[PDB]
């Protein structure tokens, strides 16, 4: 870290966020400054180049500026999707090489709770032809990332055969997982219906499937 | 991803892994390369710089080198604490900014490798009756826990609305994930088929679905 960047910025949804980048005359003062976004677990991507030029597909929210030996990144209308680390980059002329800042964690404070979207899928045609039956309860767009999944065959709770993936942080910093129930085609065709009940922050969402 | 890295690399504890990072004369060829370690949950840290310089507290087991347009990070005496995601970074003298590799997942093999079980689910009847269409690619029973998923609309790759969850260990100790694709029921019916392609350890499998 040749460039000096604050360790973090926090703001409520819709608010304005500024990120400073402090350097000398050999780097920021002489050369083009670029900005990089890094979503957790993801590699850094360029979002701004040539001090204020926005990279392809980069939203209007994002704004970039250079003045003197200091660069700034402006995010107006902060969204939950902008929660990432931001780095500023410039070529150092003093020591002929590319330099970077320490980074800045951007937090959306007081984030609104998002109920999960729930899509239940019966065993596919191709699957049953292979004497295999799998039900998928796709659980998407929820926040925070914790869920309880319960299954039922008609009225009775299904204990075994259930697997629920650990909620993973999606593109929009919101979450997704999927619960799956592997049955024998004998077990599936026997019952009248199947249920997947998803509990998120105390509230339940239940969807139902039936054969054909 | 401008620089190219293999997505997954593994070996038994005590063995050796190498991670290739391929670029051009303008990036890897001219400038100094760094390597990043992104530990599970934690913030990425630089472990290698100036092609072969190790950071503080980085053991002898980690070695970096660069020949031509490609850099390699080697790891010997592979141990569980090395399991992380690693990426390369270099300045691109033509683009006048930093370029990064897509990342590599390093796995210390603790059980037999397992090829994924792939189940493609078309949009359900209840869903299409609501003018919504969701394709779900259930990927389970695989080890190591890293997949690359590609979607095709007939044969042309789908470049939008694809979400892939992070693999999580299940009750069988093997990993599971799911890739989902959102389409308008017109997008589902305008194509002959949709396909989900799962890449795991250089082995690739294709699943296909068609309307009814």
Numbering used by the authors:
A (entry chain B), B (entry chain A): 2 to 213
Text from the published report:
LCs were distributed in two groups: a set of eight amyloidogenic LCs responsible for severe cardiac involvement and symptoms in patients (hereafter, H LC), and a set of five non amyloidogenic LCs isolated from patients affected by multiple myeloma for which no amyloid aggregation or proteotoxicity was observed in patients (hereafter, M LC). Five H LCs (H3, H6, H7, H9 and H10) and two M LCs (M7 and M8) were successfully crystallized and their 3D-structures solved. The crystal structures were all refined to satisfactory refinement parameters; in all cases the LCs were dimeric, with an overall quaternary arrangement closely matching that of the previously reported LC dimers. VL and CL domains display very different structural properties in the seven crystal structures. CL domains (res 115–214) are typically characterized by high quality electron density, are all very well superposable, and the dimeric CL–CL arrangement is clearly conserved in all the analysed structures (root mean square deviations -r.m.s.d.- generally fall below 1.0 Å over the entire CL–CL dimer - Table S3A and Fig. 4B-bottom).
